[PDB]
Design a binder for this molecule. Structure first.
Ligand SMILES: [Mg+2]
Length: 166
């Protein structure tokens, strides 16, 4: 399955108190927070977003410029894990350094954008996008994701996406 299961490896925090630092912005380590829209995030030991959960998807800056820190590449964008149109946050609690070639529409590319587009088409057509589980993998102490693992169910059918951050 890909449904959210509670875990003792993460301590839950009130939304608004999930930042360890304000200047510069940084998430607390090994925590779990639920956005007002209901999206659940988990951070690892270094304050990096590690897991994202959406029970039921629906249609509803300096952060974008600098997320990823010293590990951010020239062709990276500040990429939302959960798009704004799905109720996603525009801040660091939802942004990661994401290659523009998957974040934006690119011919024969734009995988993350294309995933979001598929989800829109499903929702618009009256189908449910359920139990989304994102796994964000990192390498060493790097703030920049290497690969995105996404699981989700479309009217019951489980789908799996592995998207390299290149
Ligand atoms: Mg995007």
């Amino acid at each position: 399955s890909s449904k959210y299961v509670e875990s003792p490896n993460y301590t839950k925090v009130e939304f608004g108190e999930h930042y360890a630092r304000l200047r510069p912005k940084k998430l607390k380590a090994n925590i779990e927070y639920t956005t007002p829209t209901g999206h659940i995030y988990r951070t690892d030991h270094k304050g990096r977003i590690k897991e994202v959960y959406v029970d039921n998807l629906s249609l509803k800056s300096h952060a974008q410029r600098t997320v990823g820190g010293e590990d951010r590449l020239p062709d990276d964008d500040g990429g939302a894990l959960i798009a704004r149109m799905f109720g996603g946050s525009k801040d660091i609690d939802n942004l990661v350094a994401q290659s523009k070639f998957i974040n934006r529409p690119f011919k024969e590319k734009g995988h993350w954008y294309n995933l979001e587009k598929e989800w829109q088409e499903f929702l618009n057509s009256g189908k449910e996008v359920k139990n989304i589980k994102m796994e964000v993998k990192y390498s060493g102490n790097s703030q920049r994701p290497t690969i995105f693992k996404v699981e989700y169910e479309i009217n019951g059918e489980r789908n799996i996406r592995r998207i390299l951050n290149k």
